[PDB]
């Protein structure tokens, strides 16, 4: 249920004598036996997790984390990544550009892998059949197939009903609209083909 | 049954009107190749014991077992006889 | 006279666990379970998952009682590691301490 | 069941304390010595007149 490869990375447990085992999303290029470094003074090879305010600027970082410690949230689906834009050493916060254009500011002590998440280019191979969409979501959750609400009865959906399959009222619904009504284009601020 | 089994090993087998399934279903196509290719390899490993050079007169021809150019075990042995001679004739005319 | 047979035990299902058909000295042809022949002792899955030589594929009962030398060679890391994955582990355990104590100590 | 490949070790393990019975056997082409210990039966099959010898006493 994920296009990105998960790399099983083992570290040593700093305190006990074990070898703690860590499951991480794999930056593209990272292979079995690469000796990954994830600390403060870590080098910046393609896969290391050196801190975000210590990575050079204009660099390419995946698996960045918003809060300092949440263990990686952002830029973590396949092929996705963030570009570091600006450091503000007076504030101590880095402004990285999320893989949606929406560029935000995070603290300069967050951690971040170096590279692109594996499995890039998944979304470009077309499915060609309903059966290859069956097996995609059977590892993911249970939302397939999508019955159009306009093909439903006017008891089960706000669009359903009529002698023709038409949305009776404008599809763009309010941001404030109650759930069960907030269906269609939610708070659509720009509508339709550009 | 053994009256037919006696009369169906030497001759009087099925005919154009006794067949009911395709020839690739009666006598498979994938196993008349298989056997006929085991034989062209069971014969070339026989001929690395003491037969011809077996480096470039075996594997020049090991891929001709699987290239459908020999259509029988016999059909193979004249082709190595056509080449073994000038493999010892070019080794004869040499001055 | 072609007898058919039964699942003698109480499990009458054809799971990969049962897999039972032998003739009997009383000619009462009847079928018996097999053992599920386990894959043998292997190297770690990470390190090129391969069967170890000098080791048997004994089941939980054969393994729990047979001798210890039926499941391990007399090397170091025998029965967990193959000679390939020992000999490479001894030079890497030594070529590293060599490149260390010369390069961790070059500061007079 | 084990088959004693010995005349010394057999006469040792055959003269042990378990000795549930010693069933003298006559079969074609051999003569077989079934000692019944508590957990095995140890056989000593032989092709010689030594059968009738170690039959009287053993």
């Amino acid at each position: 249920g994920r296009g990105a490869a998960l790399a099983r990375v083992e570290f040593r447990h700093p305190y006990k004598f074990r070898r703690v085992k860590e499951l991480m999303v794999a930056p593209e290029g990272m292979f079995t036996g690469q000796s990954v470094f994830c600390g403060q003074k870590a080098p910046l090879a393609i896969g290391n997790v050196l801190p975000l305010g210590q990575i050079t600027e204009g660099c390419i970082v995946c698996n960045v984390e918003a809060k300092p410690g949440d263990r990686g949230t952002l830029a973590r689906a396949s092929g996705d990544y963030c570009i570091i834009i600006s450091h503000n050493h007076e504030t101590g916060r880095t402004r990285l550009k999320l893989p949606s254009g929406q560029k935000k500011s995070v603290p300069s002590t967050s951690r971040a892998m170096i590279g692109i998440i594996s499995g890039g280019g998944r979304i470009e191979k077309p499915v060609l059949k309903a059966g290859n969409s069956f097996y995609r979501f059977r590892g993911k959750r249970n939302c397939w197939p999508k019955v159009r609400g306009v093909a439903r009865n006017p008891v089960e959906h706000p669009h359903g009903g009529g002698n023709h399959q038409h949305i009776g009222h404008p599809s763009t619904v309010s941001r404030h609209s109650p759930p069960g009504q907030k269906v269609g284009l939610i708070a659509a601020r720009r509508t339709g083909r550009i | 049954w053994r009256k037919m089994k006696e009369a169906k090993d030497m001759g009087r087998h099925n005919g154009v009107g006794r067949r009911e399934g395709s020839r690739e279903a009666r006598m498979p196509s994938k196993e008349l190749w298989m056997r006929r290719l085991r034989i062209l390899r069971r014969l070339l490993r026989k001929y690395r014991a003491d037969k011809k050079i077996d480096r470039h007169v075996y594997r020049d021809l090991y891929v001709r077992a699987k290239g459908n150019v020999f259509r029988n075990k016999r059909n193979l042995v004249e082709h190595i006889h056509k080449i073994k001679n000038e493999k010892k004739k070019e080794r004869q005319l040499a001055e | 006279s072609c007898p058919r047979v039964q699942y003698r035990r109480r499990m009458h299902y054809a799971t990969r666990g049962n897999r039972m058909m032998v003739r009997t000295p009383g000619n009462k042809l009847v079928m018996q379970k097999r053992a599920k022949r386990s894959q043998g002792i292997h190297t770690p899955w990470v390190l090129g998952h391969k069967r170890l030589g000098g080791t048997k594929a004994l089941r939980h009962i054969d393994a729990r009682l047979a001798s210890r030398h039926e499941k391990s060679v007399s090397r170091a890391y025998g029965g967990v590691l193959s000679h390939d994955q020992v000999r490479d582990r001894v030079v890497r355990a030594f070529l590293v301490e060599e490149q260390r104590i010369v390069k961790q100590a070059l500061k007079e | 069941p084990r088959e004693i490949k010995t005349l010394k070790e057999f006469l040792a393990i055959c003269s042990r304390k378990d000795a549930r019975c010693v069933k003298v056997k006559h079969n074609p082409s051999a003569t077989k010595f079934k000692v019944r210990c508590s957990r095995y039966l140890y056989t000593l099959v032989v092709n010689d007149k030594k059968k009738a010898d170690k039959i009287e006493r053993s």
Binding site: - | - | R75, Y77, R89 | -
Partner: protein
């Protein structure tokens, strides 16, 4: 030049697979019983365990022994190193022959040396354990 006698190696690929062992007699080519390079060598099957510094007693003897083997190991089963022991390739390197009835007493002298040469401070490395 590389495999001189008295030079310590690591016995790779054998029963003693990670042990440190010193070459005492190398060879080049034998006829039928050693087509391989034939460096006979004595080495450690029993490392002297760490001196506890606690109950200094006969237990320090029972835990500072050096058990010794002698094998003519092929050269592709060693790993030569930088070190030496200087264990008399010309004095001891000949009274340790390998023929039958010798591996009984010849083995107990290169053992009889490692007895004292560890009890004395000579190498302090050859008698550690190659941790792998």
């Amino acid at each position: 030049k590389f495999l001189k006698p008295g030079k310590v190696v690591i016995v790779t690929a054998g029963r003693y697979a990670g042990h440190k062992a010193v070459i005492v007699q190398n060879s080049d080519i034998a006829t039928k019983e050693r087509p391989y390079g034939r460096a006979l060598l004595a080495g450690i099957k029993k490392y002297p365990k760490k001196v506890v510094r606690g109950m200094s007693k006969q237990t320090i003897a029972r835990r500072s022994q050096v058990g010794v083997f002698l094998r003519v190991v092929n050269h592709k089963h060693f790993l030569p190193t930088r070190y030496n022991v200087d264990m008399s390739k010309e004095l001891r390197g000949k009274i340790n022959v390998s023929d039958a009835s010798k591996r009984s007493r010849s083995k107990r002298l290169v053992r009889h040396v490692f007895q004292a040469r560890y009890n004395a401070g000579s190498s302090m490395w050859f008698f550690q354990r190659l941790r792998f």
